[PDB]
Ligand code: HEC
Ligand code: HEC
């Protein structure tokens with residue numbers, strides 16, 4: 303059903319509101335959404351981003367501090383989604399081939415939004431994330 | 434949850450299977466439960482780069498049986514895959530690789546890594562599409 307990590311570490315039991323853009327819009331995500339997103343993160347991302355780290359480039363982690371230091375900041379659903387569709391360097395000036403680009407054939411919009419939600423929520427509230 | 438369907442239907446192992454344990458013709462007996470455990474370890478630790486037997490960051494060095502057997506020395510036995518994972522090497526074996534995931538004994542025990550090697554080895558042999566990407 304719902305993952306206990308989402309219960310325990312993300313502190314979500316029903317729903318949660320997350321920033322979609324820099325404009326002021328939010329989107330509601332359920333606990334099952336964040337559970338699905340956690341699973342997608344395990345299948346596609348965790349091997350390089352264990353615990354919110356970035357093993358092949360420790361300065362550019364998935365911590366909220368590091369996401370907010372990116373150009374543009376990677377602290378919203380829309381900016382995280384846009385990033386995975388075409389990964390970029392930290393200053394955003396060059397294409398990066400070190401992280402995993404995800405096509406719409408691989409993850410649909412809905413799926414990638416759950417992944418971004420899991421990462422954004424974990425960045426905001428999970429103990430130890432990005433350490 | 435005891436034996437996963439993928440192992441029955443795609444690895445074609447219901448009871449046991451015999452896999453090359455070393456280069457001198459010796460095999461070791463793995464059960465369907467062993468391969469299920471190895472699959473789970475692969476899904477948890479290796480799948481971002483090696484989904485379906487591919488190698489996303491270097492597709493020329495995949496988990497296909499062809500590519501495994503062409504490594505130096507060949508990576509087509511339990512012992513050779515375990516030794517690889519403990520300290521990953523380049524394809525010709527002359528240099529240390531930092532592009533794959535080294536697995537310390539603190540991460541996976543000998544037996545666990547054996548079951549992961551067995552999963553990869555059986556998949557390479559019989560799983561439809563494995564490594565052909
Ligand atoms: C290893 C091969 C990786 C996998 C698999 C995934 N990512 Fe990654 N990511 C990786 C590196 C080496 C980097 C640094 C990139 C650079 O060129 O600077 C990243 C970066 C990110 C970031 C940006 C973090 C920041 O502080 O700005 C994000 C948000 C990110 N990665 C997400 C991500 C997701 C969701 C993945 C699963 C689909 C994923 N990455 C896979 C290395 C690797
Ligand atoms: C991405 C970050 C990887 C993860 C996670 C794992 N592997 Fe890997 N592997 C990766 C690369 C880029 C390469 C090519 C290496 C080179 O220097 O030539 C490999 C290679 C292997 C091999 C050898 C394949 C061959 O044809 O000889 C094996 C057996 C292998 N990888 C297994 C493996 C396992 C079991 C992992 C999970 C524990 C794993 N890899 C993670 C990239 C990445």
Ligand SMILES: [Cl-]
Nearest residue numbers: 349478479534
């Ligand atoms: Cl891993």
